[PDB]
From a paper:
GH10 enzymes hydrolyze the β-1,4 glycosidic bonds linking the xyloside units that comprise the backbone of the polysaccharide xylan, which is second only to cellulose in abundance in the plant cell wall; xylanases are, therefore, essential for biomass degradation. It starts by computationally segmenting all structures belonging to a modular enzyme family along structurally conserved sites and assembling the resulting modular fragments to generate a huge combinatorial diversity of backbones. Instead of using the natural sequences of the fragments, as in natural evolution or laboratory genetic recombination, we next design the sequence of the entire protein (>300 amino acids) to maximize compatibility between the fragments and stabilize the active-site geometry.
We then selected the eight most active designs and two natural GH10 enzymes for quantitative kinetic analysis with the chromogenic substrate 4-nitrophenyl β-xylobioside (O-PNPX2). The active designs spanned five orders of magnitude in catalytic efficiency. For instance, the most active GH10 design xyl3.1 and the least active one xyl8.3 exhibited OPNPX2 hydrolysis efficiencies of 9417 and 0.61 M-1 s-1, respectively. To understand what were the underlying structural reasons for this vast difference in efficiency, we determined their crystallographic structures. In both structures, the two catalytic Glu residues were positioned as in the design conception (<0.5 Å all-atom root-mean-square deviation (rmsd)). We, therefore, concluded that accurate positioning of the two catalytic Glu residues was crucial to obtain any level of activity, and that high levels of activity depended on atomic precision and preorganization in a large network of polar residues that surround the catalytic residues.
Residue numbers in the entry: 9 to 265, 270 to 305, 318 to 340
Write the structure that this text describes.
């Protein structure tokens, strides 16, 4: 093949990743070839979300997740696990009490204290089982995802209402204990802009962890970013700030969301961002492209026929 291997262009800056579907992983399939050719880091689009792994209490299905991991092993890609604890794509059973009522709806102080304990157990068991299964095979775990409201207050999810603010630290310790080799990330969107309240809440929390000894290695910036905003300057201060805490940064779902002028504009923004990422490659340990957009898993980069798009030539 005559075009450059994307991940090679970024050697000794950072790995380049994509999220995949377990259906698309056969040698027969050009998708799988495009993945193996261009990327050296992989995430499960959905196979490792809570609802995928533990549909019912204590019932696990690892089929698709295993296929994805095996794919990474074969091609020697870094595996991101996504995600251990989240308020979305999480089965209802998790948050039901003894009788099968919403735990959230409990008023009695003695029973709440009992619900708290069951949820901690459930959270930790899920963590131990999943991280335990994949022990040593996972470059980085997204241990928690989207813990913040956009205003920078903690999200009032079931996790938070029942366990209270501790669930996060608890998820991180349990992950650390199950697989010490895995980098532990806290992931979110709207945390690219240093001036944003959210980005600052996340800084404060992470700082707190680093100072209190709570294991955390990295912050995951989703990187749903527009053409003009946030400014490269604003992003830079964010990278500097977190890197000052001694945590790594990953861009976990990079996306710069029709016509011929449209494409060339997005390609230039991407050029710019990648310039900025390269400038700070010491602080950044992976860039994964968002890819649900049928369009490829890296829709920014490769057309529906697997041909390079403007954006791809912009960054190589």
């Amino acid at each position: 093949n005559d075009i450059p291997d994307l991940y090679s262009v970024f050697k000794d800056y950072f790995p380049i990743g994509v999220a995949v579907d377990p259906s698309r992983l056969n040698d027969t399939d050009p998708h799988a070839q495009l993945t193996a050719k261009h990327f050296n880091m992989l995430t499960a689009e959905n196979a490792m979300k809570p609802e995928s792994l533990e549909p019912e209490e204590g019932r696990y299905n690892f089929e698709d997740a295993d296929r994805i991991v095996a794919f990474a092993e074969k091609h020697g890609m870094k595996m991101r696990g996504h995600t251990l604890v989240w308020h979305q794509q999480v089965p209802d059973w998790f948050f039901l009490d003894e009788n099968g009522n919403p735990m959230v709806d409990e008023t009695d102080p003695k029973n709440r204290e009992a619900n708290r304990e069951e949820l901690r157990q459930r959270m930790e068991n899920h963590i131990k089982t999943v991280a335990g299964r994949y022990k040593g095979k996972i470059y980085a775990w997204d241990v928690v995802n989207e813990v913040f409201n956009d205003d920078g207050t903690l999200r009032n999810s079931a996790w938070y209402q029942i366990i209270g603010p501790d669930y996060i630290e608890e998820a991180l310790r349990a992950a650390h204990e199950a697989d010490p080799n895995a980098k532990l990330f806290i992931n979110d969107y709207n945390i690219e802009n240093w001036s944003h309240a959210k980005t600052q809440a996340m800084y404060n929390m992470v700082r707190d962890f680093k100072e209190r000894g709570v294991p955390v290695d990295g912050v995951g910036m989703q990187g749903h970013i527009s053409l003009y905003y946030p400014s490269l300057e604003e992003i830079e201060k964010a990278l500097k700030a977190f890197a000052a805490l001694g945590v790594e940064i990953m861009i976990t779902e990079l996306d710069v969301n029709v016509s011929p002028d449209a494409l060339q504009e997005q390609a230039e923004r991407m050029r710019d961002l990648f310039e900025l990422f390269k400038k700070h490659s010491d602080k950044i340990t992976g860039v994964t492209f968002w890819g649900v957009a049928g369009r490829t898993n890296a829709p920014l980069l490769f057309d529906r026929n697997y041909q390079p798009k403007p954006a791809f030539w912009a960054i190589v």
